[PDB]
A paper describes a structure:
Here, by x-ray crystallography, cryo–electron microscopy, and site-directed mutagenesis, we structurally and functionally elucidate the mode of binding of a potent bnAb (NC-Cow1) elicited in cows by immunization with the HIV envelope (Env) trimer BG505 SOSIP. The exceptionally long (60 residues) third complementarity-determining region of the heavy chain (CDR H3) of NC-Cow1 forms a mini domain (knob) on an extended stalk that navigates through the dense glycan shield on Env to target a small footprint on the gp120 CD4 receptor binding site with no contact of the other CDRs to the rest of the Env trimer. The HIV-1 envelope (Env) protein is a heavily glycosylated trimer consisting of heterodimeric gp120 and gp41. The most broadly neutralizing bnAb isolated from these sera, NC-Cow1, had 72% neutralization breadth on a 117-virus panel, with a half-maximal inhibitory concentration (IC50) of 0.028 μg/ml.
Crystal structures for Fab NC-Cow1 were determined alone (2.1 Å) and in complex with the BG505 SOSIP. As in other bovine Fabs, the ultralong CDR H3 folds into an extended β-ribbon stalk supporting the disulfide-bonded knob domain. The knob domain begins with a conserved CPED motif (CPDG in the germline) containing a type I β-turn around PEDY, followed by three very short, antiparallel β strands (D6-D8, D23-D25, and D37-D38) with two intervening loops of 14 and 11 residues. Loop 1 forms a single turn of helix, while loop 2 has two small helical turns. The knob has three disulfide bonds with 1-4, 2-5, and 3-6 connectivity (D2-D23, D12-D32, and D21-D37). The knob distal tip also contains several Tyr and Arg residues. The knob distal end extends about 35 to 40 Å from the tips of the other CDR loops. Superposition of the Fabs or even of the CDR H3 stalks does not necessarily superimpose the knob domains, as the knobs can adopt different dispositions with respect to the stalk and Fab core.
Author numbering:
A (entry chain H): 1 to 27, 32 to 82, 82A, 82B, 82C, 83 to 269
B (entry chain L): 2 to 9, 11 to 27, 27A, 27B, 28 to 95, 95A, 95B, 96 to 106, ...
Write the structure that this text describes.
Amino acid sequence: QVQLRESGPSLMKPSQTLSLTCTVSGSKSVGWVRQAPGKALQWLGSVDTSGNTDYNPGLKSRLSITKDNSKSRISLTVTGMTTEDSATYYCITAHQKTNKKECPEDYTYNPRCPQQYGWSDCDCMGDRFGGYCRQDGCSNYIHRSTYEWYVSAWGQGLLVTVSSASTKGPSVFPLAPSSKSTSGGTAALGCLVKDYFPEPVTVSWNSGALTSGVHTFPAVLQSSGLYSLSSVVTVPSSSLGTQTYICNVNHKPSNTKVDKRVEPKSCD
Amino acid sequence: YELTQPSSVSGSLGQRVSVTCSGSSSNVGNGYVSWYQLIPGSAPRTIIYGDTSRASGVPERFSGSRSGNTATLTISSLQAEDEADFFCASPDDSSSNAVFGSGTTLTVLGQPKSPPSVTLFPPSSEELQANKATLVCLISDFYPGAVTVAWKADSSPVKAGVETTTPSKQSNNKYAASSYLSLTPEQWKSHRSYSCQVTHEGSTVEKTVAPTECS
């Protein structure tokens, strides 16, 4: 059970260098794949247990990957970041293996048999015939792909935004239910997360203890260049004013966490 | 280099669909294609490896095949929770140089219809004290995931100041969306009401708030 955790900046300026880290826990190769919004997955590179590194040939000059076994990390460096490089960067582990042409067990490569007798599918001759060629000892090489690769574990991904605009933490405002906005025994209350940059923002309710009907909506990009979203949760109408309801807004890009209490709408 | 996939495929509940993945002898022809499922909001999920081998937890109705330089992912008995972007991938002339496909979006049709639940929030006291006003119209629990939002100031349409999100799936396979109307606190208070109209499958739900309505 391998767990992969990406860490690094959430915001780059144009032409800055992106340095990411992946911390591997549990126990091939460890590498990086990215996906820009609305675009296809793009393999970047990987480093195997022996220290060998490989890179997307179209991006190799910009990439660099290193490892540390004592720290159980790998890194990723990406030079000359542009808006084209804004993407979610996933740390991965991959199964890798190149299979040479091998004969099955109890068989040995013997080119004399097909060379001299013309037998088919007979590159290998059973060892039980002790170097002699018998057609009932023929065999092809082990049937298998020459190259094996696939992603065995995916990290959760780190969103990286390239922009000249600077980080901004969010302003959190309450979406308080009114006496007319309820839904009988339940009611919708939420928080408006306003004017932050870059993405992402996550929102829980009561430190995760409240999950029923929770939904965080996609963010809107205002003309100011700042994002806004809303999170809503459904709540017992009889509890409005008795139970405390707090939306925990986390904005990792600015190392900001806001716990906003949502109190019943009041006529002060 | 990128493997070629169809842009999208769709099927109704219980139906069968297949996604193709075309490459060349140096990658797909090598005979070790992998498939991945990406559900918006979750990390990518490995589904198939080695052309036909299923990852742990993948049911049998997810089948992988290959003929020459074209691999195929067949998904039978379609269920709503299958909706996702599917990508193929393969080694390319090497067991460490990997290539991905362009991706294919899967839509599962025929899910239970559901009208939208609409909640309209007026500007909060805190936002007004900061000299800004935002009406928040939250739309949830509807299928199909298509709605149109229109705003009213008193009884007349409002065109300026509106931002609406494209619908996305909730944790219960139904769709949700949000719309915002930006105002100055002055014009919030200078009119008797504001409304959010949500239209879904020909039927409309309208919610209204008034500056005079405290509590």
